[PDB]
Design a protein around this ligand. Structure first.
Ligand SMILES: O=P(O)(O)O[C@H]1[C@H](OP(=O)(O)O)[C@@H](OP(=O)(O)O)[C@H](OP(=O)(O)O)[C@@H](OP(=O)(O)O)[C@H]1OP(=O)(O)O
Ligand SMILES: Nc1ncnc2c1ncn2[C@@H]1O[C@H](COP(=O)(O)OP(=O)(O)O)[C@@H](O)[C@H]1O
Ligand SMILES: [Pb+2]
Ligand SMILES: [Pb+2]
Ligand SMILES: [Zn+2]
Length: 420
């Protein structure tokens, strides 16, 4: 009920986003076996729980606005906003837990060394929170170690899988119409020395509903995981960046990963990787869990270039974009809230990741799961579960920047295009 300083030694690095630092449990209180603990970071970058405007916007959802702390905020967002929309099956809201400041200071220091320096430069554990999330550790197949034996699990951060169709995209940005944001964004990150080569992954393939472009995408992901692909053997990273995007999959890494699957994917040395990929493909496509996610993403109906206007209507600032639509600004406040609301939900949808956890089917289940892929090649039936993670609520103020970022993206992509 309260994690104290001595508990710190029981949690071990697992990874981090920009916002939270996630530790896997290494101790043995039934309380925490198979759980991860998600700890909010204090960005020196960004500087109660909800702003004025935000209370307005999330008004529909009172449970949100009357939240004591940010931990409890996420929880309710996930529980009341996300779940009805994504289903409770594959989403879990987390269980709050009290933490002492010492514990957090303690954990922070204990893991510093395993964190990417740039992450550290950017934020630490926000030692002023009294709360933290305990989640199930989806890199292990099911909650209470009755282990159905080993578990390979794969995290994918799909990002956005569709092209805008909006009536509100500038004349110069019409390219957003053709080229996925992911692909356009690569060029910039590359420019900002945030990645070391363009990724081969195209979300359009992943979300395309085409079994075959889906496989294509999984292969991309494998080749250039950046921050989009990770693979855990029993809770241990065996492919992908640790709390950051990683580099192209060299032969050295490739080999390590190949080696890492022995026994789980039961094929000839050097063939487990292609089987595993195929396996991953079939679980994703067959589960059709993507479509549902996509539906949420598509709640960005008008595109930042659309939504951005509503933002300013909502925060009661004159619109900086229009200078000296006849259309969007004619919207009842009520209608505008909706649009901006759904935008931020779509935001969430766009940046979450799926984890799929694998396991050799087990002819002892008290109820035979309904999800399994059957690997032709190796004649192995795997059971899988899907879950969505990192379903954060996006700060309303962020609309300003969403706009500028997106503007930046499209302009730089246009510039590099003119290079003909
Ligand atoms: O630090 P990064 O590895 O680049 O990850 C960030 C981060 O996502 P996570 O922190 O959940 O990984 C941003 O979210 P914050 O954590 O900063 O709140 C998210 O920004 P939004 O979700 O607000 O859009 C952003 O994605 P994007 O570049 O689409 O803004 C994404 O960067 P990449 O996904 O591009 O790496
Ligand atoms: N429920 C979970 N089970 C296993 N690993 C997780 C879970 N949640 C997060 N992680 C690991 O921690 C990473 C970062 O946590 P995340 O929730 O993405 O924080 P942020 O959103 O701040 O980046 C995830 O990509 C994943 O590798
Ligand atoms: Pb994340
Ligand atoms: Pb996040
Ligand atoms: Zn406007």
């Amino acid at each position: 009920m309260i994690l104290e300083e001595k508990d710190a030694s029981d949690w071990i690095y697992r990874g981090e986003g920009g916002a939270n630092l996630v530790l896997a449990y290494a101790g043995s209180s039934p309380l925490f076996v198979g759980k991860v603990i998600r700890i909010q970071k204090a960005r020196r970058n960004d500087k109660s729980v909800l702003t004025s405007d935000e209370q307005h916007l999330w008004r529909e959802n009172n449970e949100l606005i009357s939240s004591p702390n940010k931990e409890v905020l996420e929880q309710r967002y996930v529980q009341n906003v996300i779940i009805p929309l994504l289903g409770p099956k594959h989403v879990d809201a987390g269980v709050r837990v009290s933490v002492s400041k010492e514990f957090l200071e303690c954990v922070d220091k204990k893991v510093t060394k395993q964190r990417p320096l740039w992450r550290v430069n950017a934020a630490n554990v926000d030692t002023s929170h009294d709360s933290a999330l305990i989640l199930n550790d989806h890199s292990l197949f099911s909650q209470g170690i009755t282990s159905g034996g080993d578990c390979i699990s794969v995290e994918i951060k799909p990002k956005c899988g569709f092209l805008p169709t909006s009536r509100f995209i500038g004349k110069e940005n019409m390219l957003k119409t053709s080229v996925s944001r992911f692909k356009m964004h690569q060029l910039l990150k590359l420019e900002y020395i945030e990645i070391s080569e363009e990724s081969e992954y195209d979300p359009l393939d992943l979300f395309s509903g085409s079994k075959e472009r889906v496989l294509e995408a999984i292969k991309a992901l494998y080749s250039t995981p950046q921050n989009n692909f990770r693979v855990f053997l029993n809770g241990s990273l065996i492919l992908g960046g640790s709390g950051e995007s990683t580099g192209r999959t060299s032969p050295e890494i490739g080999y390590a990963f190949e080696d890492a699957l022995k026994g789980f994917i039961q094929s000839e040395d050097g063939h487990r990787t292609e089987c595993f990929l195929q396996l991953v493909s079939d679980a994703v496509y067959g589960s059709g869990v993507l479509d549902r996610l996509l539906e949420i993403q598509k709640l960005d109906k008008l595109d930042i270039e659309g939504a951005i206007h509503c933002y300013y209507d909502i925060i009661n600032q004159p619109c900086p974009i229009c200078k000296e639509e006849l259309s969007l600004h004619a919207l009842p406040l009520d209608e505008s809230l909706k649009i901006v609301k759904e935008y931020l939900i779509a935001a969430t949808a766009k940046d979450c990741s799926i984890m799929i956890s694998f396991q050799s089917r087990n002819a002892w289940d008290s109820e035979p799961s309904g999800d399994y892929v059957s690997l032709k090649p190796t004649n192995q039936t795997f059971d899988y579960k899907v879950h969505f993670i990192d379903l954060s609520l996006k700060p309303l103020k962020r609309m300003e920047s969403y706009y500028k970022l997106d503007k930046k993206i499209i302009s730089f992509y246009n510039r590099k295009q003119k290079a003909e």
